[PDB]
């Protein structure tokens, strides 16, 4: 059986060669009756598709970020509110909190959840001395989620939506000055050529999944579907080690390459708490019950 598996980031990003070592994991484990074929850097299905390519199985499995969703459902926002979890730990509870809510709503659709892993937490790539949320005021801003956009308004800042393939031309002719996301993508897409200093905010860590359609699950025999979840395991506790190793690395990488790291002052902090507060009381009256069972579960963890 031959599989295609869409991701929206490049070789170089760190989902990516976890799931390099995933598409490996799947042929050892299977005795190769399960081979995966990777598209890389969006280059068969762009990051807002792969959901849908994946649904309609179209692709039996795939790569999605769950916060470019969160218009399409309360349950993929989650991972995208602002001071609500700032670490792995928090970000690793939030995830077994919304895990069966996540599994439900896909399963609502004929997909399954394989594994999901968490990017590095998220900070502020500017230009601007950013000392307070006022300071954001204006900023020409990069969006990667309907939930980044939101923000953004909440801050005064402008976005326009670019996807990571995308990024680095979009600094380059200078369409966006400043945007949220992690040292990683910071490093890959060489941000420190045009953006100087990142405030290491750790304001959420939004997670990628790995979408299976149900479909094409069932046509497997016993052995290869149960090759599959190991791997898929096996990928969870990699990818979730990768980013948090990667993180110091790639922080102090920009550092080499001229780019400040800034920690956040308290006043910066406690005025995207406050958008963070805000954010979270929209989302539980959006996601009525389902939320709060979530965030009771995540506050019992
Ligand atoms: O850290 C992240 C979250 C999503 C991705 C991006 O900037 O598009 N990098």
Redesign the pocket.
């Known amino acids: 059986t031959k599989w295609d598996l869409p991701t929206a980031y490049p070789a170089s990003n760190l989902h990516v060669e976890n799931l390099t070592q995933f598409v490996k994991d799947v042929d050892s484990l299977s005795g190769g009756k399960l081979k995966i074929t990777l598209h890389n850097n969006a280059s068969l299905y762009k990051a807002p598709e792969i959901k849908r390519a994946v649904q309609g199985n179209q692709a039996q499995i795939g790569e999605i ?1 769950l916060t470019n969703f969160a218009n399409e459902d309360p349950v993929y926002e989650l991972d995208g509110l602002p001071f609500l979890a700032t670490g792995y730990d928090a970000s690793f509870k939030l995830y077994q909190a919304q895990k069966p809510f996540l599994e439900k709503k896909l399963a609502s659709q004929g997909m399954m959840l394989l594994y999901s892993v968490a ?2 937490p ?1 900070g502020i790539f500017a230009n601007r001395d950013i000392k307070q949320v006022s300071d954001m005021k204006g900023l020409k801003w990069r969006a ?1 989620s309907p939930v980044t956009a939101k923000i953004a308004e909440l801050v005064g800042a402008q976005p326009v939506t670019v ?2 393939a995308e990024l680095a031309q979009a600094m380059a002719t200078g369409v966006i000055d400043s945007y949220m ?2 040292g ?2 910071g490093f890959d897409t060489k941000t420190y050529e045009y953006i100087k200093k990142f405030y290491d905010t750790e304001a959420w860590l ?1 997670k990628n999944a790995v979408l299976v359609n149900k479909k094409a699950f069932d046509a497997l025999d016993p052995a290869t579907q149960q090759a599959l979840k190991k791997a898929g395991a096996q990928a969870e506790e990699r990818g979730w080690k990768l980013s948090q190793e990667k993180n110091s690395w790639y922080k102090e990488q920009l550092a080499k390459n001229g780019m400040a790291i800034i920690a956040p002052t308290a006043e910066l902090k406690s005025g995207l708490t406050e958008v963070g507060k805000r954010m979270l009381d929209d989302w539980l009256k959006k996601a009525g019950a389902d939320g709060q069972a979530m965030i009771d579960a995540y506050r019992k963890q």
């Open positions: 970020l990017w590095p998220q990667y996807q990571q996301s992690s990683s993508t939004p």
